[PDB]
Design a protein around this ligand. Structure first.
Ligand SMILES: *[C@@H]1O[C@H](CO)[C@@H](O[C@@H]2O[C@H](CO)[C@@H](O)[C@H](O)[C@H]2NC(C)=O)[C@H](O)[C@H]1NC(C)=O
Ligand SMILES: *[C@@H]1O[C@H](CO)[C@@H](O[C@@H]2O[C@H](CO)[C@@H](O)[C@H](O)[C@H]2NC(C)=O)[C@H](O)[C@H]1NC(C)=O
Ligand SMILES: *[C@@H]1O[C@H](CO)[C@@H](O)[C@H](O)[C@H]1NC(C)=O
Ligand SMILES: *[C@@H]1O[C@H](CO)[C@@H](O)[C@H](O)[C@H]1NC(C)=O
Ligand SMILES: *[C@@H]1O[C@H](CO)[C@@H](O)[C@H](O)[C@H]1NC(C)=O
Lengths: 36, 49, 49, 48, 49
């Protein structure tokens, strides 16, 4: 019921950098006004 | 709004369980079933006036 | 995906650029911790076409 | 200067009406040293 | 008193052959054939399958 699609491009992917993106919370602990 | 969600798994066949996320419009659906995915999966309708 | 739980953290910010992943600091907040308990090795994106 | 036990969090001190503001889910606050310095009453939602 | 029958209670399966130990709180219902030797399995219970 699903189709097959092939690309028509002729180049690999590019590359960027994550400057300071991607910081999450490593634990569920509530911390306030601290440096961990 | 072309990005709808992701697929997560190992073999992406019926012989292994997988995870699926589809935000469609109202509500998001997250299922862990045994999906037999297509080689090129995408969501269905866009609109019809 | 650690110890059976699938954890998602997200953020949503308004920008207006063309072809740039904008620099700056980003802190993502927890969305969900789902107890799905599956070995996960590969993934793929769902497009609405 | 009583012994207290609010949500399984025990202690011993003087309870007093507080002016601190908690997030809607927060149940207790912490000092610079890891000591509970404010707790939310789960029956009146009051922070003290 | 509830899980034993006079003829036998042959529900309650269990796994015996896995290529690696499970991780904490991980579930597995893979029901594939597990080659035990080095010959291919071809999905058929045989010598080392
Ligand atoms: C889009 O997501 C919505 C979220 O509500 C889903 O709508 C459900 O459609 C199913 C049939 O496929 C119904 O049985 C449910 O009653 C609907 N949801 C509710 C209100 O509980 C659905 O998963 C997606 N697609 C559709 C059909 O809207
Ligand atoms: C999680 O699944 C991965 C991939 O299926 C497993 O890693 C594979 O292990 C098999 C058998 O030991 C090897 O033949 C493959 O070369 C491995 N693949 C990779 C990508 O390393 C892994 O063992 C599984 N982990 C657990 C604990 O279930
Ligand atoms: C292309 O897609 C069809 C169905 O969408 C599938 O039957 C076929 O095996 C696919 N071919 C390849 C090479 O992936
Ligand atoms: C990171 O990317 C930005 C914009 O893409 C660029 O200005 C900067 O020079 C890059 N820095 C490094 C170390 O790649
Ligand atoms: C809990 O019970 C107390 C007295 O039994 C009542 O005053 C209060 O409204 C109830 N609900 C909440 C959310 O505290």
């Amino acid at each position: 019921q699903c189709v097959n699609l092939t690309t028509r491009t002729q180049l690999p992917p590019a590359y960027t950098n994550s400057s300071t993106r991607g910081v999450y919370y490593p634990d569920k602990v509530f911390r306030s006004s601290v440096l961990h | 709004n072309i990005i709808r969600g992701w697929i997560f798994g190992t073999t992406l066949d019926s012989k292994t369980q997988s995870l699926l996320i589809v935000n469609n419009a109202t509500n998001v659906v997250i299922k862990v079933c045994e999906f037999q995915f297509c080689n090129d999966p995408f969501l269905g309708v866009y609109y019809h006036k | 995906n650690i110890d059976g739980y699938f954890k998602i953290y997200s953020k949503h910010t308004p920008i207006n650029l063309v072809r740039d992943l904008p620099p700056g600091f980003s802190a993502l907040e927890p969305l969900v911790d789902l107890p799905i308990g599956i070995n996960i090795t590969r993934f793929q994106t769902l497009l609405a076409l | 200067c009583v012994n207290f036990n609010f949500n399984g969090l025990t202690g011993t001190g003087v309870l007093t009406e507080s002016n601190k503001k908690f997030l809607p889910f927060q149940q207790f606050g912490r000092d610079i040293a890891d000591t509970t310095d404010a707790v939310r009453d789960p029956q009146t939602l009051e922070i003290l | 008193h509830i899980d034993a029958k006079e003829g036998g209670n042959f529900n309650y399966l269990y796994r015996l052959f896995r290529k690696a130990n499970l991780k904490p709180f991980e579930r597995d219902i893979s029901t594939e054939i597990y080659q035990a030797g080095s010959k291919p399995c071809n999905g058929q219970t045989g010598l080392n399958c």
